[model samples]
Target chain A: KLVLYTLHLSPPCRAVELTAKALGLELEQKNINIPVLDDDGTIITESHAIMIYLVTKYGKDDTLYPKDPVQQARVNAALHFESGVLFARMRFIFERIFFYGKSDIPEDRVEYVQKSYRLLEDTLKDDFVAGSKMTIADFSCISTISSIMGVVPLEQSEHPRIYEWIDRLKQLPYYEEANGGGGTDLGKFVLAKKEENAK
Target chain B: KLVLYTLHLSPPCRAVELTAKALGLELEQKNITIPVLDDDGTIITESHAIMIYLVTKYGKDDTLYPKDPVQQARVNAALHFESGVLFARMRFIFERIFFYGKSDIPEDRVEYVQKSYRLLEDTLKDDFVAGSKMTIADFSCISTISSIMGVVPLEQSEHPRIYEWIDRLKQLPYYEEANGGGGTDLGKFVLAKKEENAKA
Candidate 1:
C-alpha cells in the first residue's frame, strides 16, 4: 500500500486519488494539506508528477499514461495546459476568495477564467483530452475543471463539447467518490464563505 | 533534421532551442508564433512536452530527460513549476503591458511575480533545479527567468542562490545565442513600448 498525504477538498489531491482509483491501486490516504505521495520512501509531490509516477510504477496497462512518444507528448501537452492554465486560473480566483477573504473574484480574473474555459473547449479532440482513450490528463484536468464549476458554472450552450465531455466522465464508477463529491462540497463551502463575507 | 515553428522572442521556444543545442541535435528552424514541432507528420506543441519528446527521441542518453521514475518525476515537477508558476506569472504581467495596451503592470500581478521568484528560490536543491546535473528543466526555466529580467530584474541580494544559479547557467556555450540574447532584446523592446504607451 502507498501513503498519500492529501486534502479531500483539494482539486490536485483528488486528481491523484482519481488516478489511483482508476488504476486499481490502493492508497492509504492520510488527510493533510500536502498532496504528497510516499511510495516506500520515494516521496513525490506535485499532482501531475504523482499521477504519472503512479501509472508508470503501478498501472497494469499503459493506456492511462501512454508510452509512445507522440501519444505521451499529447498527454503531457494536456497536463501542462491543465497545470499552467486551467488549474492556475482557478487557484488565482479561489485562493483570493477562500484564504484572502475576498468576497468576489475580480472581473479581469473572471475573464481569464472564461478564457481558460474556451481553451478547454478547444482542446477536445475525442471523448477525452489527449485522444480517444482516457489518460491521466483527464484525471488531472477534470479535478480542476470540476472545482471551477462551483464558481464558474459551465454553460452547455457555450461549451457543448466540454459539457458533454464532463457528463461522459461523470459516468465513471469512482468519479463521484474520488472527485465529484468533494468538488460539490468545495463549491458549496466557497459560495457560503463568499456570501458570508459579503454580508 | 526537424522543423521547429518558433518565434525568436519567445521564452518557451528558446527553451526548445537550448535543449536541442545541448543534446547535439539539429533543428531546421521555421520562424512562427506557434512554438510547434513537425517531425514527419507528428506535430507537437507546448514547450515542456516538446522538450521531453525531443530528448526522448533524439538524445543519445537520458541525462537531460532522465528515464528513472524518481529522477524524471523531479524533472517533471520542475518543468511544471516553470510552466504553471514562472512563465504563467510573467505572461500575465507582460501580456497586459504588451498586448492589452496597459502602460504598467498591476500591483497585485507584480506581487504574484515576486511570489513566483520566491517559490523558485525555495525550489533549488542543488546546482540545477532538479539535482546536481543540469537538465531540460534548466532550459525551460532559464528562458523565462532571463526574459523576466526585462521587467522584474532579479535582485541578487534578495535571491542570492537564484542569482548564482543564473550565473552558473549563463556559462553554457549556447546560453547567450539560444536564450540570453533574445531575452535582452525582449526586455529592451518591452521597456520602450511601456514608455511609449505611457506617453500616449
Candidate 2:
C-alpha cells in the first residue's frame, strides 16, 4: 500500500492524488497539515517532486513523463519554468495581494504571469508538451495554475482559453474523484480569498 | 543538429552544455543574452527551460533521465525540490548579497540560503539524490551551485562539504570545458563580484 502524505487543498498533492487515481493505484492518505514533508522525514516539501515521484513509480506508460528524448527534455524545461519562474512570480504576487507583505511583485509581474499562461495555452494547442500525449510537463503547468487559482482567480477576461482549460480538467471523471468531489473547491478558495481581501 | 540558445554564464545552460559534452552530442551555441525568447517570440527567459529542451531532444541514456519508473519519479522529485525550494532560496540570497540595486538582502534571507545549502549537502550523501548515478537531479543541483559560486565565494569555512563537492565536480573533464578551461576569467568574475559587494 503506497502512503500518500498530502493536504486536501494543495495542488501538488492533488496532482499526485489525481494521477494515482487515474492509474488505479491504491494510496493511503496521511493527510499532512503542512502539505510538504515526506514520510521518511526528508523534506519532500514541493508538489513538483511528489508528482514526479508518483509518475515515475506507478505510471505504466511513458505518457505521464514520456520517453522521447527531446520531448522529455521539453517536459523538464516546462517543469523547471513552472517551479522556478512561474511559481516565483506567483509567490511574489500572492504575498503582496493576499499576505499584505513586502514583495518584489511589480506592476509588470501580472503581465509576466499572463504571458506564461498564454505560452502554455499555445503549447497545448499542438499536443501535450512532450508530443501526442499528456505528460508530466502538462501536469507541472496545470498544477501551478490550479494552485494559483486557490489564491487568485483566473477570470474569463484574463485568460479565456485557460478558463476553458480549467473547466475541461475538472469535468474529467478522475479529477472529480481525486479531488473528493470538491474539485471546484480550488475555484472557491480563489473567490473566498478575493472576498477576504476585499473586506 | 540541435540549436542551443545559451549564455555561457547561465547555470541551466551550463548543465545542458555539460551533459551534451559528456554524451558527445554536438550543440550549436546561439549565444543568447540575459533575457531569452522562445521560437514563438514569447520570452522563455529562464535557464531551466532551455536546458530541458535540449535534453528532451538529444539525451541518449535512460540514466540521464532514467526510464525505470521508480527511479525516474525519484529523479523528478529531486529536480522539483531543486526548482521550487532550493533555487528559490538561492536566488533570494543572491539578490540580497549581490544585486543590491533594489535593497540590501535581509540577514534572515542570508541565513535561509545557508540552511538550503545545508539541506543540499545532506541530499548529496546518498551517492546521488535518487540513486548511485549522476542523473538530471545532480545536474540541476550542481548547476545551481556553480551559478552561486559565480556570484559569491561560497566560503569553505561556512560550507565545508559543499566546498568539497564543488572541488570534486571541478575535477570532472566536462566541468573544465563547460566553465571555460578553469581559467582566471571565471575566477575573476566570482572574486570581483565578492570584492565589489564588500565595498558597498
Candidate 3:
C-alpha cells in the first residue's frame, strides 16, 4: 500500500493523486501539503521527485515516462517550469488571502499569472506538454493551472489551448476525486476567505 | 561542443558552469540571462535539466550524480527547492534591474532571501546540501546562496554550516571563473543600481 501525505486543496498533491490513479495504484492518502510517501519502508517528499520515483519503481510500462534521454529532458524542463515559474505565480496570489487576509487579488499577481500561462503555452506544441502523448508532466502542470483558474478565470478565446489542455486532463477516470472534486473545495475556500477578509 | 546561454551573475547558470568544470567538460559560453543549451541540435532549458543531461551523457562515472534511487531523490529534492524557493528569491532581486529598472530592491525581497537561506540551512545537515558528497544539487543551490549573500548577508556565526559549505565548494579550481569572478560583477551591479536609485 502506498501512503501519501497531501492536502485536499493543494495543486501539487492533486497531480500526484492523478498520476497514482492513472497507474492504478491505491494510495493511503492524507491531507498535508508535503508530498511524503512510504513505499513499503522508503520515504520520499517533493511532489515531482516522488512522482518520478513512483514511475521508475512501480510503473510497469514506460508510457507515462519515456526512457530516451532527449525525451526525458523535455519532461524535466516542463516539470521545472511548473515548479519555478507557474507555481510561484499561484502562491503570490493565494498567500494574500491565506496569510495576509486580503480581499482583492492583487494586480501585479494577476499579471504574473498571465505571463506564466503564456510561457506555458509557448512550451506546448503538441496535444500535451513534453510530447504528443501525455506524460507525468501533464499531471504535474494541469494541477497548478487548475488552481490558478479558480482565482483568475481563463478566457477560452484568449487561452483556448490551455483551456483545452485542462479539459482534456479532466477526462481521466480519477479526475473528479483526484483534482476537480477537491479543486471545488479549494475554490470555495479562497472565495469564502476573500469575503470574510473584505471587512 | 556544449553551447550555453547564460549571464555572469545568475546562480542557476553558475551551477551549470561549476558542474561542467567538475566533470572536466568545457562549455561554449554566451552571455544571456536565459539558461539554455543547444546540445548538438536538441534545445534544453532550465539549469537542472541541462545539468542532468550533461552528467548523464558525458559523465564517465556517477560521482556527481549517483545512480541510486533513494540517494538521487534526496538530491532531486534539493534541486527543486533551489528552483522553487532559492532562485525565486534571487530573481525577485534582479528583475528590479532588467525589467522594472528599479535601483533598490524592495524590503520584502530581502526578507525572502533571508528566509530562503534559513530553509537552505535546514537542508544542509551534512557537508553539502543533498548529502555528504557535493552533488549537482550543491552547484545549483550554492550559486543562489552566493548571490543572496551579496544582498542580505548571512552572518557566519548564525549560519556557520552555510558558510562552511560555500568555502568548501570554493576549493574547486574552476570556482573563480565559474562562480566567484562573475559574482563580483553581479554584486557590483546590484550595489551600483542601489546608489543610482537612491538619487532618483
Candidate 4:
C-alpha cells in the first residue's frame, strides 16, 4: 500500500494525490502541517520528491511516466526546469514578499517572481511539456503552480491562459476528489495571503 | 545526429557528458559557453531539457533510468530532491559566499544544502544510491558537487567520504575526460562567467 505524506494545501502533494486517483491506485493519507520536516526522522520533506516517489512506485504503466526514450527525457527535463528554475524563483519571491516574520519585499524579488510566471505560462504552451500527451512533466508543473496559487495571486484576469488551465484541471474527476473537496480552500488560501499583503 | 548544447563546467552538463562517455556513446560537442541559452539559442537555454533530450535519444538500456516502476520512481525522487532542495541550497551558498550576487541567502538554504549532502553521503555508504548498481541519480549528484568544487573549496577534512568519492570518480575514464585534464583555466571556463570577478 502507498502512503502519501501530504499537505492538502500544497500543490505538489495535490498533484501526487490527484495522479494516484487518476490511476486508481490505492493510497493511505498522512496530512502534514506546513514547514514540518521528517516523517519519523526519514526526512521526506519536499513535496516534489514525495510526489515523484509515489507515481514512480505505484504507476501501473509508462503512461504516467512514459517509457519512450524521447518522451521520458522530456518528462525529466520538465521536472528539472520546474524544480530548478520555477520553484527557485518562486521561493525567492515568497521569502521577499510575505516577510512572513521577515522584512519588506525586495524589488528584485518581485521582478523575479513575475518573470518566473511569464516563463512558466509560455513553457506550458508546449505539447504537454515533454510532448503530445500528459506525463509526469504536466503533474510537476501543475503541482508547483497549484501550490503557488496559495501563496500568490494568479487570477484568471492576470494570467488568463494559466487561470483557465487550472480551472479545467480542477474540474477533472481525479482532482476534485484528491483533496477531499478542499481544492477551493487551497485557492482561498492563496487569495487570502495576497489580501493580507495587499498585493 | 543528436547535438548537445552544453557548458562543460556545469555539473548537470558534466553528468550527462560523463554518462554518454561511460556508455560509449559519442557526443557531438557544441563547445558552448556559460548560459547556454545565450549560445545555442535552442537547446542550450535549459540544461535540464538538454540532458533529457540526450538521454531520451541516446540512452542504451532502461538501466540508465530504469524501467521498473518502483525503481524509476526512486530515481525521480532523487532527481527532484537534487534539483529543488539540494541545488537550490548550493546556489544559495555559491551566490552569497562566492558569486556576490545582490540577494541575501536564506538561513534555510544553508541548512537544506547540508542536509542534502548528509543524506547523499549516507546513501553512498551503501555503495550506490538506489541499489547495487549505479544509476542516473548518482551521476546527477556527482556532477553538481564536482562543479561546486570548481568554484568553492571542498576540503577532504570537511567532507571526508565525499572527498574520497570524488577522488575515486576522478580515476574513472569518463570522469577524467569530463573534468578536462583537471586544470585551472579548463575548470574556470566550464562554469564561471567570461570575465572573472576580481573577488571570484
Candidate 5:
C-alpha cells in the first residue's frame, strides 16, 4: 500500500527501490519524485527518511538495519554520511556538467570527488559499508558510487575493494532493477557530456 | 557521563549543544568534531545523527524529537533538508571563501541562500521548524541559519518570520553557548572581508 515517488536516474530513489525490494514490500513508483504516499496516507519525501520509514513500518525484525542501539547508530551514521558527503559530491559534479558545461572538471572539483571515493574505499574495507552484513547503507552508497563510476571510471587497480563491494552488491536479487537497467539508466553524463561540450 | 567532540565554529555542533542543554543533560564538550564519543564508548558523528542519539539515549523522553511515527517523519525530513540543501549552500560559500578566495559571494549563491531563507520562513509558519513545539529539527536548522546570518546578514523586512523564529530561539537559556559567541561569529564576512582583503 505504498506509492513511491521516484526518479530512477537518481541514486537515492534507486536505494529506496532496492530497500523496498529487499524488504519484499510493493511500492508503486511514480515520476513525481516528491511527497511519496505510504499506505497509511502519509506523504513523505527525502529518500533517506522515506527508506527508514519503510524499514520500521514494514521490515521484518531488524534483519537489514539492526535494532541494537550501537549497531543502529553506525547504520544511521552511514546513511547520514551518504546524505551529506557521498551523494553530495556526485550532485556537485553533475551540476557543474549540466549548468556550466565544463567538461574538463576543475582540478579542485576532481580532487574532491577522488577524496570522497577514497573515503568510500575506507568504508568498504569490510564486506560492506557498515560491516559484516549488507544494509540499506549498501543500497544508499551503491546508488551513488555506481553512478559515479559511470563518470570517473573507478579504477580496479587503486580502488579494488570498493569495486569488489559493488561486484558483490550486484549479486543481490534486486540489483539489476536497483543499480542497472531502468534504475541506473539516467542518461548519465559526466565525462561524455564534458568532452562533448568541450570539443 | 557523555563526551561531545565538537567544533564550536560548526553550526551542527552548536545545534547539538543547544539540544543537550535544553534536555538538561550534562556533557563534556571537546574540540574534536569529526567523530563524537558517547558515555558507553560508542563513537558517532554527523550532527543530525549525534543530536538524535543524545536525545534518545539521555533526554527524559522524545520531547525534542517525538516518538510518534508521522511526527518523527516530519522531523527527519527537516533534518535531511538541512543536510542536503541549507547547510549545503553555506558550505559552498565557506569553501569559496577558503579555497577560491572569493571575497564576494556570487549572485547565484546569494539567490540560493535567499531562496533557502524564504523556504525556511515558510516552515517557521509553524511554532518551529518541524511543528508547533520546538524539536531537534529547529536546532538543526537554527545551527545553519544563524551561522549564515552572521555572514550574510539576513534582512528582517524581507524575512520577518525566519528572523522571528531566530529571535525566539535566541531566548533559550543555552542559546548563547550553542549558537552565539564563536559559533555564529562567522563575522559578517561577505562584504567586509571582500573589501578588507581586496586591500590585503
Candidate 6:
C-alpha cells in the first residue's frame, strides 16, 4: 500500500496526485513536509522524483516516463527547468505573500512570472512540455503552471501554445478532480490573500 | 563522437565534465547556453539530465547513477535539491556579481548560502549525499558547493560532514582536472570582480 503525505493545495503534491491517478494506483492519502510517498516505507520526496518512481515501479507502461535515453533526457531537462527557473519564481511570490504578508505582488516578481510565461511560450512547440505524448514532465510542470495562472493569466494571442496546452490538459479524465480542484483552491487562496493584504 | 557545449567556469558544466570523465568517455569539448551534450546529434541539456542520460546510456555499470528504483530516486531527489535550493542560491550571488555588478555579497544572500550549508550538514548522514556509495548526485552537488566556498567558507566546526565530504571527493583522481580547475577559476573571478566593484 502506498501512502502519500501531502498538502493538496501545493502544486508538487498535486503533481503526485495526477501521477497516481494516471497510473490507476490508489494511494492512502496521509499528511507532511508535503508530497512525500511512502511505498511500504521506502520514502521518496520531490514531486518529479516521486512521479518517476511511481511510474517505473507500478505503471503498466513507460509511456509517462520513457526508458529511452533521449526521450527521458528531454523530460528530465524540462523537470530541471521547472525546478531551477519556473518554480523558483513561484516560490518567491508564495513566500512574499504567506511569510512577509505582502498586500500586493512585487513588480520584479511580476516580471519573473511573465518571463516564465514567455519561456513556456517558446518551449511548448509541441503538444506537451516534453514532446507530443504527455509525460510525467507535463504533470510536474502543469501543477506549477496551472496554479500560477491566477497570478499572471496566460494570453492566448501571446502564449497560444501554452494557452492551448492548458486547454488540452483540462480535458484529461482526471484533470478536474486531480489537478483543477486544488489549483482553483490555491488560486482563490492566493487572490484572497493578496486582496486582504492590499486592504 | 560526443560534443559537450559548455562553459567550464560554470558549475553545471563542470558537473557534466566530471560525469563524462567518471564514465571514461572522452568528449569533444565544444562551446553556449551550456552543458549541452551532442551525443552524435541526440542533444541533451541540463547538467543533472545530461549526467543521468550519459550514465544510463554509456556507463559500464549503474553504480554512478543506479537503476534500482529506490537508489535512483535518492539520487534524483538530491539532484532536484541541487537545482531547486542549492543552485538557486548560488545563482543569486552569481547574478548579483556578474549581472547587477554588485560589490560585496548582500546580507540576505549570504544567509541563503549559509542556509544551504546548514541543510547539507543535516543531510549528510553518510559518506555521500545520497548513500554509502558515490553516485552522479555527488558530482552535481559538489560542483555548486565547491564553487560557493569562496562566498561562505564551509566551517569544519559548523559543517563537519560537509567539510570532510569535500575533502574525500578531492581524492578522486579526476577531481582536480575536471572540477577543481574551473571551480578555482570561478572563485578567483568572483573575488576579483567583487574587489573591483568595492574600490569604485
In terms of DockQ, which candidate is strongest? Answer: 1
Selected candidate, larger TM-score, 1 vs 6: 1
Displacement of residue A179 (Cα, Å) in model 5 is 2.7
Tens-digit lDDT track of model 3 for B116-150: 88888888899999989889999988777777677
Per-residue lDDT of A5 in model 2: 74
Interface RMSD of 1: 0.7
Winner of 3 and 6 under DockQ = 6
Model 6 ranges off by over 4 Å: A194-199, B198-200
**TM match of model 1 to true structure:** 0.97
Best by lDDT: 1
Model 2 alpha-carbon drift over 4 Å, by segment: A33-61, A91-133, A180-199, B33-63, B89-103, B106-112, B127-132, B150-153, B180-200
Q: Residue B75: error of model 1 in Å?
A: 0.4
Go through the candidates in order and give each one's C-alpha lDDT. 0.88, 0.60, 0.82, 0.59, 0.76, 0.86
- For residues A57-158, write the lDDT of model 3, one tens digit per residue: 788987787777778888888888888888777876787788888899868678888888888787777879888989988988888887777777767787
| Best by the TM-score measure | 1
Estimated TM-score for each candidate: 0.97, 0.72, 0.95, 0.75, 0.90, 0.94
* Model 1 lDDT tens row, B1-200: 68899987899999999998998878889876258999888899989999999999998989999999999999999998998899888888888878878897778788888888888888875888998889999999899988887788678888887988999988999899989998788878888888888885
Of candidate 2 chain A, the 10-residue stretch with the lowest lDDT total is: A34-43
On the 0 to 100 scale, the lDDT of residue A156 in model 3 is 76
Error of 6 at B40 (Å): 1.9
Q: Clash totals for all models, in order?
A: 0, 8, 2, 3, 1, 0
Sort by DockQ, top down from the best? 1, 6, 3, 5, 4, 2
Task: Tell me which residue pairs clash in candidate 1.
Answer: none
User: Cα lDDT for residue A105, model 3?
Assistant: 83
Per-residue C-alpha lDDT of model 2 across residues B104-194, encoded as one tens digit per residue? 4456555655666777777666566656777767666777766655544466786766766667667677776775442324334544665
TM-score of chain B of 2: 0.73
C-alpha RMSD over true interface residues, each candidate: 0.7, 4.4, 0.9, 4.1, 1.4, 0.8
Candidate 3 chain B weakest ten by summed lDDT? B97-106
Clashing pairs in 5: A103-A194
Model 5 chain B weakest lDDT span, ten residues long: B182-191
Clashing pairs in 4: A99-A102, A150-A190, B37-B45
Clashing pairs in 3: A6-A32, A7-A32
Please state the Cα-based DockQ of model 3 relative to the true two-chain complex. Answer: 0.72
